[PDB]
Amino acid sequence: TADLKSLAKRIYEAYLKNFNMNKVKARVILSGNPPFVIHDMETLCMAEKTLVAKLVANGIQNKEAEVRIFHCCQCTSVETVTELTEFAKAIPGFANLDLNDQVTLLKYGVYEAIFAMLSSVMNKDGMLVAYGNGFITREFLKSLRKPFCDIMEPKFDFAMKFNALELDDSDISLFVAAIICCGDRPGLLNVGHIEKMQEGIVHVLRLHLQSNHPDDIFLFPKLLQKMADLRQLVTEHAQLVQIIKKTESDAALHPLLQEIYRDMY
């Protein structure tokens, strides 16, 4: 249908406009300001001086390397939450929802969306960082002392299977919209209206996948399962973040992320 084809394009266009990184751009960079490779402590410190020089300009008062990385990961998340919040406006009916419901949907959806979209900048060897200007290796992230190493690898595990689906940005934009419009989030005021909004996006996603991936007759239920997988990934992530908060006094939580996690799971 023309209105459904146009809805899929409106959401794709809103995705290309609001996210600084997309999968086409990421794949160009990942093929080879070429990305500076962070693969050990020496190169982490070099990258810091060029790409986040403010963070390491304190001398002996700088934080432990694992804590600096954790801070930079949170800063990345904060930026993606801002992009996700503006993206959400192109989802039909989202801006027509109660202001409090918009908050609840974004609260439970953003980290599912973050980990889905992280896959676009990940390969089996590492991931893009710092607006495409660095590449940090998966082995280096695994090498961080506990518990900071444990933040990283489950996200690569998710991403490698997600990337094997060979989605493109036109698919992922609709998937991220579908994540944001979940009617079963806790605390929603107008569940009925959200379910109808969800049904419309999921309807467009199913038709789009049929059209864009005729080779994979199971792709739509595969992506439904990935949404469930992402919910569990986020629950587990929040638990690990809580461990870091209680046992690592130097790893301050950004206040915006603090409020996202507050009363989440």
261 is in an annotated binding site: yes
Nearer residue to ligand HW3 within complex by CB, 29 or 257: 257
45 binds, among ligand HW3, a copy of itself, none (CB under 5 to 8 A by kind): none
Site track for a copy of itself across 38-67, x = CB under 8 A: ------------xxxxxx-x----------
Q: Does 133 bind a copy of itself (CB under 8 A)?
A: yes
Looking at residues 165 to 204 of the shown chain, list those that interact with a copy of itself (rule: CB under 8 A): none
Inter-residue contact 111 to 237 (CB < 8 Å):
yes
State how far the alpha carbon of 143 is from the alpha carbons of 114, 151, 152, 153, in Å: 23, 12, 10, 11
Nearer residue to a copy of itself within complex by CB, 129 or 244: 129
H/E run at residue 43: helix 41-51
Inter-residue contact 198 to 123 (CB < 8 Å):
no
Residue showing tokens 């990283």: 152
The Cα 228–Cα 240 span in angstroms is 19
Q: Does 253 bind a copy of itself (CB under 8 A)?
A: no
Q: Does 265 bind a copy of itself (CB under 8 A)?
A: no
66 binds, among a copy of itself, ligand HW3, none (CB under 5 to 8 A by kind): none
CA 38 to the chain's CA centroid? 21
79 binds, among a copy of itself, ligand HW3, none (CB under 5 to 8 A by kind): a copy of itself
**List 157, 166, 250, 259, residue binding a copy of itself (CB under 8 A):** 157
**In a 3-state reduction of DSSP, which class is residue 122?**
strand
Nearer residue to a copy of itself within complex by CB, 142 or 262: 142
74 binds, among ligand HW3, a copy of itself, none (CB under 5 to 8 A by kind): ligand HW3
**In a 3-state reduction of DSSP, which class is residue 229?**
helix
DSSP 73: H
Site track for a copy of itself across 66-105, x = CB under 8 A: ------x--x---x--------------------------
Amino acid at 139: E
Residue showing tokens 């160009």: 28
Nearer residue to a copy of itself within complex by CB, 98 or 131: 131
**List 77, 132, 201, 251, residue binding a copy of itself (CB under 8 A):** 132
Measured torsion, CA atoms of residues 25, 27, 33, 35, in degrees rounded to the nearest 10? 130
Burial class of residue 15, CB neighbours in 10 A (0-12, 13-18, 19+) = buried
**In a 3-state reduction of DSSP, which class is residue 145?**
coil
Write out the residues near a copy of itself by the rule CB under 8 A: 17, 20, 33, 50-55, 57, 72, 75, 79, 130-134, 157, 161, 206-207, 210, 214, 217-218, 220-222, 224-225, 227-228
* Binding-site annotation: residue ranges: 77, 111, 261
